[PDB]
Amino acid sequence: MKNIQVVVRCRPFNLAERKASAHSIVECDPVRKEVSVRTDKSSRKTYTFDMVFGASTKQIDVYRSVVCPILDEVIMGYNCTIFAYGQTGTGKTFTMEGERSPNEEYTWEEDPLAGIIPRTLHQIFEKLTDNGTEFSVKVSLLEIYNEELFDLLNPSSDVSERLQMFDDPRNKRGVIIKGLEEITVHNKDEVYQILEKGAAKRTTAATLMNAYSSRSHSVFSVTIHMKETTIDGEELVKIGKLNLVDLAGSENNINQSLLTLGRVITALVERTPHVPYRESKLTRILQDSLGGRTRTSIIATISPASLNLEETLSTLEYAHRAKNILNKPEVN
């Protein structure tokens, strides 16, 4: 019924990466939707994708191109998932979250470094406010490290108080995180405080665990309840859910969820009977995002530099096979 959308976003060279060559090692053609990696010397591999975003691609463009459509399907009542996959330092967190621009030069609302989450949560209150709907928005931020489950929006618990997971009685292909805080967002003003607090707790989590950013998987969920009255006089309810996932660096028990994600994707595309969803917290959590009833997009992030060429290639081969996975999306 529907393929997994795969897009690529390359970042500019960072201060560490040396550009030796006259012309690029990685080229991004947004018209042909291709990436070409130069690796003999006139020798290459070209990969085709659904969208391609080059080094100069601004945040607002990633949002417009990728998320605004997905946010329409969410409002129809589809479950949607976007995950960022790639090497540490390529821009997964910059894409899904973004960064904050110093000393109040921009309201969070206008910040050019703002990423998907903050923009998406702004837009929900604009789109839904005057589309006639009567609605509620609730969000949760969960992170997975060393197969353990940390809640970053819990206002009160020690961040080292980790949560449990069991199979959802009303969804053969999902789970429930017992105790996970779901915060009701009453309007766009409450959004910053909630996300700020979220990012603060993370900092705390970082001090306790080794290389936590790179090894952590982050799952931010927004859920929209929308109720409505039909011409026949009934009461139609639909539940949108959007999963914005920032994955552990492709390069990596610490790695069980990333390993298992690979094994799931491999199984799916090669059409093997057993897809081991159950072998990791992540793949148990996203089971439905990966050959199930969810609309899934991946944003594979890459470097343009020779230093990280091999992880870039890996990341390309890996995201490219994921286009072959078929989901069956369904609403309510």
Ligand X SMILES: Nc1ncnc2c1ncn2[C@@H]1O[C@H](COP(=O)(O)OP(=O)(O)O)[C@@H](O)[C@H]1O
- CA-to-CA distance for 246 and 244, rounded, in angstroms? 7
Residue 93 engages ligand X in binding (rule: CB under 6 A): yes
What stretches of 231-280 show up as alpha helix (H) in DSSP?
256-269
- The dihedrals phi and psi of 189, each to the nearest 5 degrees, come to -65, -35
Residue 90 engages ligand X in binding (rule: CB under 6 A): yes
129 is in an annotated binding site: no
Whole-Å CA distances, 235 to 61, 135, 228, 260: 37, 13, 6, 41
Is residue 175 classed as helix, strand or coil in its secondary structure?
Answer: strand
Using CB atoms within 10 Å of the CB of residue 132, give its burial: 0 to 12 exposed, 13 to 18 middle, 19+ buried: exposed
Out of 12, 112, 155, 179, the residue judged to bind ligand X by CB under 6 A: 12
Q: Which of 116, 294, 84, 121 is nearest to 224 (CA)?
A: 121
Q: How far is the CB of 274 from ligand X (least distance, A)?
A: 31
Judged by CB under 6 A, the stretch of 113-121, 172-180, 271-279, 316-324 that binds ligand 5C5 is 113-121
Map tokens 């500019």 to a residue.
12
Handedness of CA 245, 314, 15, 63 (dihedral sign): negative
89 is in an annotated binding site: yes
Chain residue at closest Cβ approach to ligand X: 91
164 is in an annotated binding site: no
Residue 60 engages ligand 5C5 in binding (rule: CB under 6 A): no
Does residue 45 contact residue 35 with C-beta atoms inside 8 Å? Answer: no
- The dihedrals phi and psi of 198, each to the nearest 5 degrees, come to -55, -45
Residue 95 engages Mg ion in binding (rule: CB under 5 A): no
Out of 91, 118, 292, 304, the residue judged to bind ligand X by CB under 6 A: 91
Out of 93, 218, 312, 327, the residue judged to bind Mg ion by CB under 5 A: 93
Judged by CB under 6 A, the stretch of 46-54, 63-71, 111-119, 253-261 that binds ligand 5C5 is 111-119
Type of residue found at 212:
Y
How far is it between the farthest Cα atoms of the chain?
70
Q: Which of residues 118-137 bind ligand X (CB under 6 A)?
A: none
Whole-Å CA distances, 30 to 36, 65, 150, 209: 11, 12, 38, 39
Judged by CB under 6 A, the stretch of 48-56, 58-66, 107-115, 285-293 that binds ligand 5C5 is 107-115
Out of 49, 77, 79, 89, the residue judged to bind ligand X by CB under 6 A: 89
Q: Residue 200 or residue 236: which is nearer to ligand 5C5 going by CB?
A: 200
Which residues, 6 or more positions from 284, have their beta carbon under 8 angstroms from its beta carbon?
A: 165, 175, 277, 278
Q: Which of residues 193-252 bind ligand 5C5 (CB under 6 A)?
A: 195-196, 198-199, 220
281 is in an annotated binding site: no
What track of x and - describes contact with ligand 5C5 for positions 114 through 153 (by CB under 6 A)? x--xx----------------------x------------
- Residues in contact with Mg ion by CB under 5 A are 93, 213
Task: Name the binding residues for ATP.
Answer: 86-93
- Residues in contact with ligand X by CB under 6 A are 11-12, 14, 88-94, 99, 301
- Residues in contact with ligand 5C5 by CB under 6 A are 93, 97-100, 108, 111, 113-114, 117-118, 141, 192, 195-196, 198-199, 220
